[PDB]
Amino acid sequence: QGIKSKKIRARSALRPLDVAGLSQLLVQVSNLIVDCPEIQRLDIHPLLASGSEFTALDVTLDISPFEGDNESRLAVRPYPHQLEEWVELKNGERCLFRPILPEDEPQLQQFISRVTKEDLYYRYFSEINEFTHEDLANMTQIDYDREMAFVAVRRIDQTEEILGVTRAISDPDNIDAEFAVLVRSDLKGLGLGRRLMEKLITYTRDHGLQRLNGITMPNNRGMVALARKLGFNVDIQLEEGIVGLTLNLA
Amino acid sequence: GLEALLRPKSIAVIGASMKPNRAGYLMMRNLLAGGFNGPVLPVTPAWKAVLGVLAWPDIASLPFTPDLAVLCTNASRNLALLEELGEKGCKTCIILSAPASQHEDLRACALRHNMRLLGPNSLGLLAPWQGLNASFSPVPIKRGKLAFISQSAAVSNTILDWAQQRKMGFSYFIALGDSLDIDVDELLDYLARDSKTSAILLYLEQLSDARRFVSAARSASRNKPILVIKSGRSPAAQRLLNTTAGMDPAWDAAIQRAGLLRVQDTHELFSAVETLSHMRPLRGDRLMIISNGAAPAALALDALWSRNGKLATLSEATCQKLRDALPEHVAISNPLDLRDDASSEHYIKTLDILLHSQDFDALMVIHSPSAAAPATESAQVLIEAVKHHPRSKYVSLLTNWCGEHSSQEARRLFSEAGLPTYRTPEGTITAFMHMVEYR
Amino acid sequence: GLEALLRPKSIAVIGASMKPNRAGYLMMRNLLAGGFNGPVLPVTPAWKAVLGVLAWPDIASLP
Amino acid sequence: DAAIQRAGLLRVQDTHELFSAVETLSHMRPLRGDRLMIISNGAAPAALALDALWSRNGKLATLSEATCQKLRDALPEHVAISNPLDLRDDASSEHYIKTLDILLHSQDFDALMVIHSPSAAAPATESAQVLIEAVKHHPRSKYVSLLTNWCGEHSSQEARRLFSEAGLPTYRTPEGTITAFMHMVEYR
């Protein structure tokens, strides 16, 4: 963009300008400044570009002390790779639990076909709706501050196939949240849902929330059985057929 | 939650009056002419009925608790009236004006009673799909698919005037004020999840925190296109609007990072209104032009040459088929068919052949009024031809009838059919390049 | 006397409806577009409001 | 470009500035300077103009203390007395005439630009009629150039027709007026 807009000339010298080296230099600068917060201003002038080599002539740093959290000072936060996990299933099978990425949209559209209808309902603005494709596409684009989603994935023949999804959305004041879990057909009874719920409980309690809210059907006995196994509150709404689940994280 | 604001069941107008020079008068008249499905309750001790509706003296005498309240009284009473509402138990309130102070007391009261405020100095809210017109504007609006958010009351009124005079239908129309309690980030989620909305338009003048703005915009940008316009670029403009100055180049970076698009002036803004509606999303970036004159197309090419656009190349089969339609048209050897005295018959004979190929992604038809081909007949013929073809679904269409006086009816017919149309050339190219860059 | 007919202070429409194919609909619409200076009271249990005006279920419930 | 500069002529880019050129070559009297004064009933339009005038290095006007004093007491709560863009929100036609009469009496600017955004207080047609008669009856209107911009396309057709009949320039958008003004200044 800089070159094309003629803000920076490409052949000011007898030779062209290499872009890979300059991009690498900028990436190094970004790493340095993000890592170290004591730096308040940095100035490199002149920067000597000679073909494939780049060098610094004079550099000036203005620094200040103290820093609160080193992360709130930014506007976009990176991908939390420290939550990536390998889990061996009940039947000895291996799979990977990890946060969601924008590249998972195709895989997500097939996985939704082979899922029972009853579990596909959620509560939005005092209404009950059911997931569609747009909802999943939206779920792929996430900020890992106020909304989180985990997927359980399997690797076969250089493809990734999804088994289960879980999502949690938090309120502006950081006092409530809403959760949802989806599992594929022919995968029930293996504890996958329980593992996903435990992983969500850990993350949410560490975030600093108070309680967790959800809903499901009364006819569906597996989810209510699991919630009871947790021992957390299940209320039943009459004349509407909705069962509300409450889990107080203390 | 914002469901008591964007979908109320009952409304109480505080300050309703029978004086035509009042804001309560206009609020009541706008509310009773919309098609609302709930009660409208005027509260005043100075009349027994307002425009034929029985009135109540005070908030405590209301038969039940309302969902929404609009304060059309003066600012001096604000802090008292809010308190009363808190006792009654209402959820949201719209405030007309404030003296730039007591924002602290307003926020304290709202937090104490768990209430949400639509920023003071706000023009109001329009929801055509619910028949809701809780606004102070003097011009009507229609159902549609385009949502608009504005910041300043002067800006809100100027833009809604420009819009209604541009006539375009809308899905939502929210005018924030000081953004004391409800801000852009909160509205972006609701609008993204909405189904009647197809595109979002913003007019920004200042921001409180850009982190949440970028986060929410990033989240909502993968559903529908989003466009922006900002105006704080010169020192006189900075001082008249009372905003900080030295951050302009950072705004471009943030807009790029969030995946949004920026427009310069309002002349490209009604082009934006015409293109966000009536135009289907593209599948490529190859353009084909046809016209009955050399100069117009030339004026277009230069514009397309200044934004690095792509032209279309015609297949030999299509070139052969086009030949024998009429002699002395060398234009079979370029992506701009050219005529001088063509009739509508040549127009249809070209459209049918061209639509059958797989050579381009968008077609631009230019007309200069002439004796051989009158404007209205050509418009009707083109509309029917587009109707009956089976390939018209996979192609984008742009029209440009270049005669102001004699092309009003043709433009009205095009608009009725749902076809985009633009006044002058290189106004179509600007929209086409806008969409290509967005994609 | 004919002063309660040719110069009323209040009117009650019995049968007010939100169906455009009704006489109550037309009566309410005509009454609200005239410039009357008193209350117009719709009486019906089949709606909660007619054209934006709160309704009452029966004659005995009128204020 | 070199030859056009040498011959003393002016160049325009596209046809969108061409009907502005048609509107300005007729109906507009030649200028005597380069100072501009703006009045409007809304903040954003003027701002959109300023940026444009800032991108061509234009000149604004400064108001005399006597003119500032006379303008005061016409209507309170108008900070705009302290800048060369009078600003209103819900003004009426009376404010328009009471501003025009005082402004035309001074010797502070060389051209006046009036902007209107339709509103309930000031309908377009009556405001246009009032402006036309006010310009008619003043004795100083000879020595000033006038520009108008009624910004409502649907509701301002009749006002625009009346302006054209009176022989007054009129433009569809803001900074379409500034383009013409800077064109003429550069030509001079």
Side-chain angles (χ1 to χ4, degrees):
Chain A
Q1 186 173 355
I3 264 60
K4 183 172 286 176
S5 155
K6 280 184 142 313
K7 313 308 295 283
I8 286 156
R9 276 129 164 151
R11 284 196 92 203
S12 310
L14 82 179
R15 275 184 328 192
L17 181 67
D18 72 303
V19 299
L22 196 53
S23 46
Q24 185 60 53
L25 186 269
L26 297 165
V27 165
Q28 292 166 7
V29 165
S30 162
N31 283 342
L32 164 55
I33 69 101
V34 166
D35 167 354
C36 174
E38 272 70 15
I39 298 157
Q40 278 301 129
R41 183 182 174 272
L42 168 62
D43 196 338
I44 303 178
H45 62 308
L47 178 74
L48 208 73
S50 289
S52 148
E53 84 90 4
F54 298 77
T55 310
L57 257 164
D58 286 14
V59 310
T60 308
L61 269 73
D62 307 348
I63 72 194
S64 282
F66 307 127
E67 172 48 36
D69 54 8
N70 186 66
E71 210 68 2
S72 297
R73 69 197 249 254
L74 299 98
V76 178
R77 64 176 40 222
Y79 178 76
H81 64 77
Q82 62 256 348
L83 304 167
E84 199 158 352
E85 259 191 13
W86 276 102
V87 72
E88 293 177 350
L89 229 58
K90 183 178 179 180
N91 70 334
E93 193 61 51
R94 295 176 64 186
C95 67
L96 182 87
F97 287 11
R98 62 157 176 83
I100 208 168
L101 284 161
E103 305 108 87
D104 300 349
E105 196 278 281
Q107 321 316 312
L108 227 56
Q109 91 194 130
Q110 308 140 220
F111 154 82
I112 205 79
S113 275
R114 310 163 287 282
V115 172
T116 318
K117 167 56 69 84
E118 296 300 77
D119 53 29
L120 285 175
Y121 291 35
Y122 62 101
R123 168 166 61 190
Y124 183 66
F125 267 156
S126 64
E127 272 216 356
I128 270 63
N129 289 337
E130 67 164 65
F131 288 88
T132 65
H133 294 48
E134 303 284 22
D135 286 1
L136 319 169
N138 186 347
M139 209 172 320
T140 47
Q141 269 287 335
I142 296 308
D143 83 309
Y144 316 91
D145 174 41
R146 196 163 287 183
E147 154 163 343
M148 200 78 215
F150 292 100
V151 305
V153 65
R154 172 188 289 165
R155 149 69 79 224
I156 297 159
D157 281 56
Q158 309 308 318
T159 204
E160 298 294 356
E161 176 183 52
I162 291 172
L163 289 314
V165 187
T166 174
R167 177 197 76 180
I169 306 177
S170 162
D171 64 60
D173 289 345
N174 207 13
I175 277 143
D176 257 340
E178 279 254 86
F179 81 88
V181 291
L182 311 181
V183 181
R184 185 150 91 74
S185 281
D186 80 75
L187 260 287
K188 319 304 290 289
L190 310 189
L192 191 46
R194 187 182 51 83
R195 308 272 189 151
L196 291 162
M197 281 299 332
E198 308 226 332
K199 173 66 173 188
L200 202 79
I201 289 278
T202 312
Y203 173 76
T204 321
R205 189 200 305 287
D206 284 273
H207 219 49
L209 272 150
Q210 299 293 303
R211 82 189 53 90
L212 219 73
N213 312 62
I215 66 101
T216 165
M217 302 303 198
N219 177 287
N220 181 304
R221 188 64 76 266
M223 218 54 41
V224 58
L226 189 37
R228 290 231 178 262
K229 183 200 155 139
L230 260 300
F232 295 34
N233 313 327
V234 59
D235 176 279
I236 197 153
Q237 285 106 62
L238 288 283
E239 187 201 277
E240 227 187 339
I242 298 304
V243 211
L245 284 39
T246 319
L247 297 91
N248 207 79
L249 297 164
Chain B
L2 297 179
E3 279 293 1
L5 176 68
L6 294 325
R7 222 166 308 258
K9 303 261 147 278
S10 195
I11 314 172
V13 183
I14 286 100
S17 64
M18 284 301 284
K19 297 173 156 63
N21 66 276
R22 289 291 220 153
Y25 194 90
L26 188 55
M27 179 54 78
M28 281 291 295
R29 197 212 60 201
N30 272 345
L31 274 172
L32 286 174
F36 187 51
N37 267 309
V40 181
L41 304 141
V43 184
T44 185
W47 318 91
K48 293 179 179 179
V50 176
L51 290 166
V53 189
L54 183 90
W56 277 269
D58 53 43
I59 288 161
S61 47
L62 291 171
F64 51 80
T65 308
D67 271 15
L68 189 61
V70 189
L71 278 185
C72 308
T73 57
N74 289 337
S76 163
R77 321 247 294 290
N78 282 356
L79 266 296
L81 302 166
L82 251 177
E83 215 257 342
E84 287 181 70
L85 296 162
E87 271 90 59
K88 193 67 159 174
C90 55
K91 314 314 306 157
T92 65
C93 178
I94 308 169
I95 296 155
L96 167 67
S97 289
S101 171
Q102 87 246 50
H103 292 6
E104 285 74 22
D105 307 90
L106 293 164
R107 66 184 182 277
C109 193
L111 204 72
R112 177 194 322 142
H113 286 302
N114 187 25
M115 284 223 262
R116 320 233 49 203
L117 301 177
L118 195 55
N121 312 106
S122 155
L123 187 67
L125 166 67
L126 298 104
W129 288 98
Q130 279 132 249
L132 193 71
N133 189 347
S135 87
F136 294 118
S137 55
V139 312
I141 89 167
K142 220 189 68 48
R143 277 181 182 185
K145 276 167 98 54
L146 175 65
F148 191 95
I149 309 180
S150 178
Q151 256 211 312
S152 194
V155 171
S156 294
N157 223 329
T158 310
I159 294 286
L160 212 159
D161 205 310
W162 150 93
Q164 193 285 311
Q165 279 41 40
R166 278 292 308 190
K167 337 268 178 41
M168 213 53 273
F170 289 94
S171 165
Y172 278 99
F173 203 114
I174 302 114
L176 299 157
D178 304 355
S179 305
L180 173 53
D181 199 47
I182 292 169
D183 221 336
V184 193
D185 48 283
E186 177 151 44
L187 294 174
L188 278 179
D189 289 345
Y190 181 97
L191 284 177
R193 260 204 61 108
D194 189 77
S195 56
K196 310 307 306 204
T197 305
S198 192
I200 298 161
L201 255 177
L202 264 80
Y203 188 115
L204 282 172
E205 179 180 322
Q206 181 170 0
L207 264 180
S208 47
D209 39 29
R211 291 193 297 274
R212 277 286 304 146
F213 170 71
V214 172
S215 184
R218 203 177 155 93
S219 175
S221 195
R222 64 144 308 104
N223 282 119
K224 320 137 165 79
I226 303 181
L227 300 89
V228 197
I229 170 153
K230 193 159 177 281
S231 76
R233 318 200 81 171
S234 78
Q238 293 150 26
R239 88 180 42 132
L240 180 125
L241 297 176
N242 312 306
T243 72
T244 318
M247 68 193 88
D248 203 64
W251 276 93
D252 293 335
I255 284 162
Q256 272 194 91
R257 193 80 166 213
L260 321 171
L261 184 68
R262 193 177 186 170
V263 302
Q264 298 320 287
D265 56 359
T266 54
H267 219 101
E268 307 172 332
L269 189 63
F270 27 71
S271 299
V273 183
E274 185 68 37
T275 189
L276 287 194
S277 49
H278 291 157
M279 168 135 168
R280 63 181 87 218
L282 283 149
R283 313 189 304 191
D285 39 10
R286 291 123 61 195
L287 185 74
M288 182 69 221
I289 298 107
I290 82 179
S291 68
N292 63 4
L299 294 158
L301 289 184
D302 290 335
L304 189 72
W305 153 260
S306 205
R307 274 173 265 249
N308 312 43
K310 212 164 300 323
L311 266 174
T313 306
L314 277 197
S315 315
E316 289 276 15
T318 309
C319 283
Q320 256 298 107
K321 292 181 64 32
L322 257 162
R323 193 89 245 141
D324 324 284
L326 196 156
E328 68 116 359
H329 290 119
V330 51
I332 314 309
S333 324
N334 83 77
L336 317 100
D337 253 332
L338 203 293
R339 303 83 137 268
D340 289 345
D341 46 311
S343 44
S344 64
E345 187 252 351
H346 307 336
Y347 269 100
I348 44 178
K349 299 296 183 181
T350 326
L351 264 172
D352 60 0
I353 289 164
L354 272 164
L355 268 166
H356 262 315
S357 55
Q358 293 177 335
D359 274 20
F360 53 78
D361 282 297
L363 192 59
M364 188 178 159
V365 187
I366 311 180
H367 178 86
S368 289
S370 72
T376 309
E377 295 62 340
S378 266
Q380 273 153 12
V381 159
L382 195 131
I383 287 158
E384 281 340 295
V386 166
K387 183 178 179 180
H388 182 62
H389 215 273
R391 220 80 69 81
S392 186
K393 142 63 208 73
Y394 316 84
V395 180
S396 270
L397 258 281
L398 309 146
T399 68
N400 184 27
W401 258 234
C402 287
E404 173 263 285
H405 184 51
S406 314
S407 70
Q408 308 278 94
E409 191 50 54
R411 276 180 202 171
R412 182 189 78 72
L413 282 164
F414 279 129
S415 154
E416 265 171 359
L419 257 55
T421 191
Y422 307 88
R423 287 173 307 183
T424 204
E426 62 267 311
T428 321
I429 297 293
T430 302
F432 179 67
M433 284 330 282
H434 275 333
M435 265 310 110
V436 164
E437 190 222 329
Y438 161 80
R439 209 170 79 91
Chain C
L2 297 179
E3 279 293 1
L5 176 68
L6 295 174
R7 222 165 307 257
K9 303 264 146 277
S10 195
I11 315 174
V13 181
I14 285 96
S17 66
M18 282 299 282
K19 296 173 155 62
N21 65 276
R22 290 288 218 160
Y25 193 91
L26 188 53
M27 179 54 78
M28 282 292 294
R29 195 214 60 201
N30 272 345
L31 273 172
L32 287 174
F36 186 51
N37 265 309
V40 181
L41 304 141
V43 182
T44 186
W47 317 92
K48 293 179 179 179
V50 178
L51 289 165
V53 189
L54 182 89
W56 277 269
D58 53 43
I59 287 160
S61 51
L62 291 170
Chain D
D1 291 335
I4 282 161
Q5 271 195 93
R6 192 78 165 212
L9 323 171
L10 184 69
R11 194 179 186 169
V12 302
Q13 297 322 287
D14 57 1
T15 56
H16 220 162
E17 306 172 331
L18 187 62
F19 29 70
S20 298
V22 172
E23 183 70 38
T24 189
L25 285 192
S26 46
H27 292 157
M28 194 168 147
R29 64 181 87 219
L31 284 148
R32 313 192 304 192
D34 325 300
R35 293 119 62 194
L36 185 73
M37 179 78 221
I38 296 107
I39 84 181
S40 73
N41 64 340
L48 292 157
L50 290 181
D51 291 337
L53 190 74
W54 153 260
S55 205
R56 278 176 250 255
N57 314 52
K59 211 166 307 316
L60 265 165
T62 308
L63 276 198
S64 313
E65 289 267 21
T67 305
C68 284
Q69 256 297 104
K70 291 181 64 33
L71 254 166
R72 186 89 263 161
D73 324 284
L75 193 300
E77 79 109 4
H78 276 121
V79 50
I81 279 52
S82 318
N83 74 72
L85 318 94
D86 264 345
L87 188 280
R88 292 76 137 272
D89 303 272
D90 45 318
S92 37
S93 64
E94 40 280 20
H95 302 152
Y96 268 99
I97 38 180
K98 290 215 274 264
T99 328
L100 256 179
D101 59 357
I102 290 164
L103 272 164
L104 267 166
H105 263 314
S106 53
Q107 293 177 335
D108 276 22
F109 55 78
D110 277 298
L112 190 60
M113 157 182 208
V114 188
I115 311 182
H116 179 89
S117 287
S119 73
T125 307
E126 91 185 10
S127 268
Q129 272 151 11
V130 160
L131 200 95
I132 287 158
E133 50 80 356
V135 168
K136 183 178 179 180
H137 182 62
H138 215 272
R140 218 82 69 80
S141 290
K142 293 179 179 179
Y143 322 81
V144 178
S145 269
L146 257 283
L147 308 144
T148 65
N149 183 25
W150 260 234
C151 288
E153 160 253 298
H154 184 47
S155 315
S156 69
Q157 301 294 306
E158 189 51 51
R160 270 177 191 161
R161 181 191 78 70
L162 283 164
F163 278 130
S164 154
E165 304 257 41
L168 255 55
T170 192
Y171 306 88
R172 288 172 307 183
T173 204
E175 74 247 61
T177 319
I178 298 294
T179 301
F181 179 67
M182 276 343 276
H183 273 329
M184 278 300 90
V185 165
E186 188 225 328
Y187 162 79
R188 213 169 79 92

